[PDB]
From Swiss-Prot:
Membrane topology category: Lipid-anchor
Record Pfam families: Peripla_BP_4 (PF13407), Peripla_BP_7 (PF18610)
Ranges in a coiled coil: none
Function: May be involved in the transport of sugars. May have a role in chemotaxis.
Taxonomic placement: Bacteria, Pseudomonadati, Spirochaetota, Spirochaetia, Spirochaetales
Gene expressing this chain: mglB
Name of protein: Glucose/galactose-binding lipoprotein
Keywords, alphabetical: Cell membrane, Lipoprotein, Membrane, Palmitate, Signal, Sugar transport, Transport
InterPro entries linked: Bact_Solute-Bind_Prot2 (IPR050555), MglB-2_Peripla_BP (IPR040740), Peripla_BP_I (IPR028082), SBP_2_dom (IPR025997)
Gene Ontology MF: a single term: carbohydrate binding
Family that this chain belongs to: Belongs to the bacterial solute-binding protein 2 family.
Compartments where located: Cell membrane
GO CC field: outer membrane-bounded periplasmic space; plasma membrane
Length: 373
């Protein structure tokens, strides 16, 4: 077993060590030891994946998708918080995919695009892209999306061939319109439980997942690999992109970015073809019970009140950990003060490895200071 704390595995996850202003990765933190890694997802490519989902849908569709037969695929777009990078990325992704991108992710900025539908070339028009703001100033507002959808049906009628949304909340809001045209294709983003259920019902046409289960498995699997004596390629491949010695393997695609020591889950489209893999509580059948020696991990969460971490990430971790014979202890902070986590990152001698979700992305050395000796 590893004798010195400074040599024990350290997996940063979900918030990447980096300068908070520039995003430059903190390689001092990443190079703590050669058993230090980061697990996240391919976030910058999320909009590309949403775009590709829509293009693939159109490519395998028939001309009946063109409801008014005018040779144009018309769409309406629900934009979330206009100042938020997620809105910008997703808007850019779908506009570039459809050829309507002009250089701007703003509402009202689009040009005529093009796409293949059922083996024929069509023009594409963004009939309207609009931020869904509540009358209280709230962003990505569900009720505003419902109202906008109803007004869009009234205004554009059967020029609307599909609805695209920066997120699931707004797409589900559109589906609440009393005049939602039956079967009209609609796409969201986030793979929320209700959205995936809707995909299963053939209502929402598709959404996009960050593969939280793959990320949770990767954190634990990296640690399993290291504590069992893997070093180098096997650490980031075994159980991750190919089966490990027990036959376990993450089902979703996962990347490794060597320069920053980051294991990054792909974003995945969620459609009628795979929706059951993404429903609330669904777990990866590719990860089964192992008989490896039991090991102890202390894992931190930067904010106990973060719903994604509380409701999606942590339950995934707790499902997979026992399967990998990891005894997982979890401590959780307040989302504001690093000390809320640091002061709980204690009695480290009880553990074999560590997983850290920092409040501030530049706090790496405060954690490694505790593992020096
Ligand atoms: Ca049309």
């Amino acid at each position: 077993g590893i004798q010195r704390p400074r040599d024990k595995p350290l997996v940063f996850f979900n918030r990447q060590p980096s300068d908070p202003l520039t995003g430059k990765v903190d390689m001092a933190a990443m190079n703590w030891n050669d058993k230090t890694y980061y697990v996240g997802f391919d976030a910058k490519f999320g909009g590309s994946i949403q775009g590709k989902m829509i293009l693939d849908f159109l490519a395998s569709s028939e001309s009946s998708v063109d409801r008014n037969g005018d040779g144009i695929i018309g769409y309406v777009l629900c934009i979330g918080d206009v100042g938020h990078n997620d809105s910008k990325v997703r808007t850019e992704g779908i506009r570039r995919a459809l050829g309507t991108w002009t250089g701007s992710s703003d509402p009202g900025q689009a040009k005529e695009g093009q796409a293949v539908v059922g083996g024929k070339s069509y023009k594409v028009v963004e009939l309207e892209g609009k931020a869904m703001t509540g009358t209280d100033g709230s962003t990505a507002n569900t009720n505003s999306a419902t109202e906008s959808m109803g007004s869009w049906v009234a205004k554009f009628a059967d020029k609307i061939d599909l609805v695209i949304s920066n997120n699931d909340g707004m797409a589900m809001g559109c589906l609440q319109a009393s005049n939602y045209p039956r079967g009209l294709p609609i796409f969201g983003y986030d793979a929320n439980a209700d959205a995936v259920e809707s995909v299963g019902k053939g209502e929402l046409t598709g959404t996009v997942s960050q593969n939280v289960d793959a990320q949770a498995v990767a954190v634990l699997q990296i640690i399993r690999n290291l504590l069992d004596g893997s070093s180098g390629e096997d650490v980031v491949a075994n159980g991750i992109s190919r089966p490990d010695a027990h036959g376990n393997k993450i089902s979703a695609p996962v990347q490794y970015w060597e320069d920053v020591k980051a294991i990054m889950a792909d974003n995945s489209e969620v459609t009628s073809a795979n929706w059951k893999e993404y429903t609330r509580g669904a777990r990866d059948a590719g990860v089964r019970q192992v008989s490896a020696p039991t090991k102890k991990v202390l894992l931190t969460v930067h904010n106990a009140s973060n719903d994604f971490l509380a409701s999606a990430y942590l339950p995934a971790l707790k499902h997979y950990a026992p399967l990998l014979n990891v005894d997982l202890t979890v401590v959780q902070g307040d989302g504001q003060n690093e000390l809320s986590c640091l002061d709980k990152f204690t009695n480290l001698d009880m553990f074999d490895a560590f997983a850290v979700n920092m409040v501030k992305t530049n706090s790496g050395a405060d954690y490694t200071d505790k593992l020096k000796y």
